[PDB]
Symmetry: C3
Subunit: 211 residues, 3 copies
């Protein structure tokens, strides 16, 4: 039914308006589904698209491009190799390989090789050894992951973020450095003052002797 | 009802597909129109590809500027050298070099060179941040100020960035900072604050001693 | 050998199960390789995929989509224009244009126009004018790059990161602002104390001349 194969062997365009352009053992089952080519691909979702080896573009609007990208949650994308989005993980976006989406919530983005999804936390405040930090902006959706535990990735060439009480811009090392220079100066001032207080203490104690 | 007259144009199969551009390809689907030189529609339904060397697949995409890539559902690209992959994304004419991997984004305020990642993500204009005033405290000499932005969410719907490596901490560093680096600096600040209190106690007791001495006169 | 062209001119589907759906001067040489269309594309890798103008999807599972994306390292992806991954850079993901992968290591991710790759550094500690900061989390492959030197990009709409001794969450401007408010307050407290110590010194010095 306005379906097209294409060329190759054992290819099936079973979906209405579906297309398999070629390759081997490609099955496009969804309405408006597409397999550009490769081998052992499926595309069961409406308007889905797969190319490469052993992908499953198996939910509506799924994009699965490369090797062994499985998509079974709506409006999701996986490009690269060995990635899986499972049914009821919606709007998940992977550009990466050998990822882990066990903990990826809806809306989450995974970037890079060996990258893991992680559940969003709500961080409005923080307590650091008896000091309270309060009033954090942007305590919301999923997360954006750039690596996994034990295999973290630096983010580089990051522009200086707005530094203010509502800012939700990322901060770079120079901004931390700049605040730390003041902290280091405060700590030296405290020492200078301490020396002064000690000397003042000695003079008082000196004074009563030979009064 | 297919249409492939021009040099090296190909349809493909399906219905109401048109490969009007020189070397253009529509591999199949329904109501796909590839109009640009070297344009390509892999399949799906209601796709356009008016740009040179453009590529669309899925439902209702417009890969309508040079080298546009529009892949999924309802990706409209009308700005040169731009990409949208996912769902309901738009790059307008005069937004160049913009890259979206996401859905239901907002590129109203996105400038040239922006990257949008994720669902409900909004574009934002770059600001120049060379310094900052916190209370009466001045912070200066920030790196990576005076290109577009990289957005990970929208106002009210921000996203944590996780598994970030410790960034270099130096006066020229443009590396992102992670929570353990702010924690480390905060431990020292907390220690300064306690030291201040200890010292304040000591000054008060020294004060009393001075006052007591006058009443030994 | 289950190969398919497609339409167009000077297209070649030389690989087993390879597909060129159309276009001009496309050569698909790898097993299970695919060229969706365009002009002057190559796909020498197994299960590779190219579309657009002048791409090389020339390593296993390569995805090269747009204009002048060259992939010659395994399991890599480039989408956009003018991007290159050389033989011996594996698992590199580019969504961007006019990038520089000279210094990109394996596993690294490049985002956006004019973006440069950068070697990972190990940052366990830092020394800021006589102050030591230690105990950093997330220190030991590749980096995630958002710009180049001189063309840094701000990251925006970042959620508040966890603030703890092990956190590898990114930090936003409001979190730095929150810490800086306390630093500013420490600094004023130091001034107030300094004034007090000065006055106490005057009392001591005056007293001796009431003797
Ligand atoms: Cl401080
Ligand atoms: Ni006396």
């Amino acid at each position: 039914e306005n379906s097209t194969v294409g060329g190759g062997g054992y290819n099936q365009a079973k979906g209405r308006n579906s297309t398999v352009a070629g390759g081997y053992n490609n099955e496009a089952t969804g309405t408006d589904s597409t397999i550009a080519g490769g081998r052992k691909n499926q595309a069961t979702g409406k308007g889905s698209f797969a190319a490469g080896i052993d992908n499953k573009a198996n939910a509506d609007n799924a994009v699965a491009l490369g090797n062994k990208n499985t998509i079974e949650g709506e409006n999701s994308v996986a490009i690269g190799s060995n990635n899986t989005v499972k049914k009821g993980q919606q709007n998940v976006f992977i550009l990466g390989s050998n990822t882990d989406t066990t903990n990826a919530q809806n809306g989450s983005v995974l970037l890079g090789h060996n990258t893991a999804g992680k559940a969003a936390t709500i961080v409005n405040s923080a307590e650091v050894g008896g000091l309270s930090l309060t009033g954090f902006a942007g305590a919301s959706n999923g997360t954006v992951s750039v690596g996994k535990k034990g295999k973290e990735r630096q983010i580089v060439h990051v522009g200086a973020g707005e530094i203010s009480d509502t800012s939700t811009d990322a901060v770079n090392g120079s901004q931390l450095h700049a605040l730390a220079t003041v902290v280091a100066q405060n700590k030296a001032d405290i020492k200078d003052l301490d020396d002064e207080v000690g000397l003042l203490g000695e003079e008082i104690n000196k004074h009563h002797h030979h009064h």
